[PDB]
């Protein structure tokens, strides 16, 4: 659950 | 981990100024990264994204088309490309390992877009538990980094916040130390400007 | 954009009470993958921010048991169940789901203690500033609380007001305490025209003002 990249 | 930036200082409108990350302590190459500025409001702003190859460089539209992000996965350097600066731009920027979110963030590094000239500051001591202290005046850009026997003075400190006066900037900073320790020992007040590029160590005497 | 607006701007904490920050979006911050994207940064006084939580609820590694995140559609919320010292700074939320990623306006949150006294000090103009040809006179009043404090100047013992420049620092995060520098700026030869110098501060702790003066 690392934030995804744009 | 560790970061370390670079590359701050004073801008005159319209130009354009470079900064540089010193990446440590984990494998560079493996992580993206990102840029963060505070505004003098205190105000946070995410200003540019890239993943860990050096790709899908992103940014908002305040600054997309005038600040450049890059790497080099080599050096182990994350770097900052900003042009035809405006005023909203000045702010501390932040340089930041980003995972889960912006997990391990650098000190930040100064930036300044304004007209007027850099100008150093001057150092007074300030004498008579003791307390004691340092008074720098009259410089700019902000900012100063103030410490007490070259950081070996930690504790019984604190450095008041600079004021704007005449477009000048003015702080004190305060230090309180045993009777016993002085003058019996030497008590320094070492200030440091970076925009200026210069340092003074003031020795506090009777 | 997605807009974050926080509540309260301030909160004010005894030790041991607990803190709660809500964060507000002016939409849903759902990520196409379905999963929210909330994050919660602390700025303690003089430091870069730090993460505390990501994914609205779960803790970074090293951020202790009481702080708790929670919330969905629009409403988040942080939670400091037994609140210490070194929790006093800044707050904000922020959204990472929709770009451009945003951030909240900030909480500030203070810490409750018990009234103290400042700690006087007036130091005259050095002889390095008097070549200059001015004169700074300065006073730190240090380690009270709460913040709010008077100091007034006296020259000769007339009031003096023109000049006068004040700067407080943030709160204390081992003590919970403000600190503040009064300096009285002059030229050399206004100073040296007068004698008796004196600042004085009044708090709401004695009615008595503290009173420190030097002469020449």
């Given at each position: 659950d690392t934030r995804p990249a744009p | 981990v560790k970061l370390v930036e670079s590359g701050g200082g004073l801008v005159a409108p319209g130009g354009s100024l470079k900064l540089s990350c010193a990446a440590s302590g984990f494998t560079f190459s493996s992580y993206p990264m990102s840029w963060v500025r505070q505004t003098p409001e205190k105000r946070l702003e995410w200003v540019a994204y890239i993943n860990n190859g050096g790709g899908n460089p992103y940014y908002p539209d305040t600054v997309k088309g005038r600040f450049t992000i890059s790497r080099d996965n080599a050096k182990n350097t994350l770097y900052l490309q900003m042009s035809s600066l405006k005023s909203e731009d000045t702010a501390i920027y932040y340089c930041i390992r980003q995972y889960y979110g912006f997990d391990y963030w650098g000190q930040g590094t100064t930036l300044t877009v304004s007209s007027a000239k850099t100008t150093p500051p001057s150092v007074y001591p300030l004498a008579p538990m003791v307390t004691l202290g340092c008074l720098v005046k009259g410089y700019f850009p902000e900012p100063v980094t103030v410490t007490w026997n070259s950081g070996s003075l930690s504790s019984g400190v604190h450095t008041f916040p600079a004021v704007l006066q005449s477009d000048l900037y003015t702080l004190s900073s305060s230090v309180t130390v045993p009777s016993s320790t002085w003058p019996s020992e030497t008590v320094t007040c070492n200030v440091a400007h970076p925009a200026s590029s210069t340092k003074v160590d003031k020795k506090i005497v009777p | 954009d997605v807009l974050m607006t926080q509540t309260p701007l301030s909160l004010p904490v005894s030790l041991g009470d607990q803190a709660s920050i809500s964060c507000r979006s002016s939409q849903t911050i759902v990520?196409?993958?379905?999963?929210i994207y909330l994050e919660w940064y602390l700025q303690k006084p003089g430091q870069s921010p730090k993460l505390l939580?990501?994914?609205?609820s779960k803790r970074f590694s090293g951020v202790p048991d009481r702080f708790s995140g929670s919330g969905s559609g629009t409403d988040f919320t942080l939670k400091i169940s037994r609140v210490e010292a070194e929790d006093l700074g800044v707050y904000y939320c922020f959204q990472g789901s929709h770009v451009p990623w945003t951030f909240g306006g900030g909480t500030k949150l203070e810490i409750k203690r018990a009234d103290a006294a400042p700690t006087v000090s007036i130091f005259p103009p050095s002889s390095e500033q008097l070549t200059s040809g001015g004169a700074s006179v300065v006073c730190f009043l240090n380690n009270?609380?709460?913040?709010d404090i008077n100091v007034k100047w006296k020259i000769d013992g007339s009031e003096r007001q023109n000049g006068v420049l004040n700067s407080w620092t943030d709160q204390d995060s081992k003590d919970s305490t403000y600190s503040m520098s009064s300096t009285l700026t002059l030229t050399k030869d206004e100073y040296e025209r007068h004698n008796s110098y004196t600042c004085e501060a009044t708090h709401?702790?004695?009615?008595?003002p503290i009173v420190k003066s030097f002469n020449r």
């Open positions: - | - | 990520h196409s993958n379905g999963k939580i990501y994914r609205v009270f609380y709460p913040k709401k702790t004695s009615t008595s």
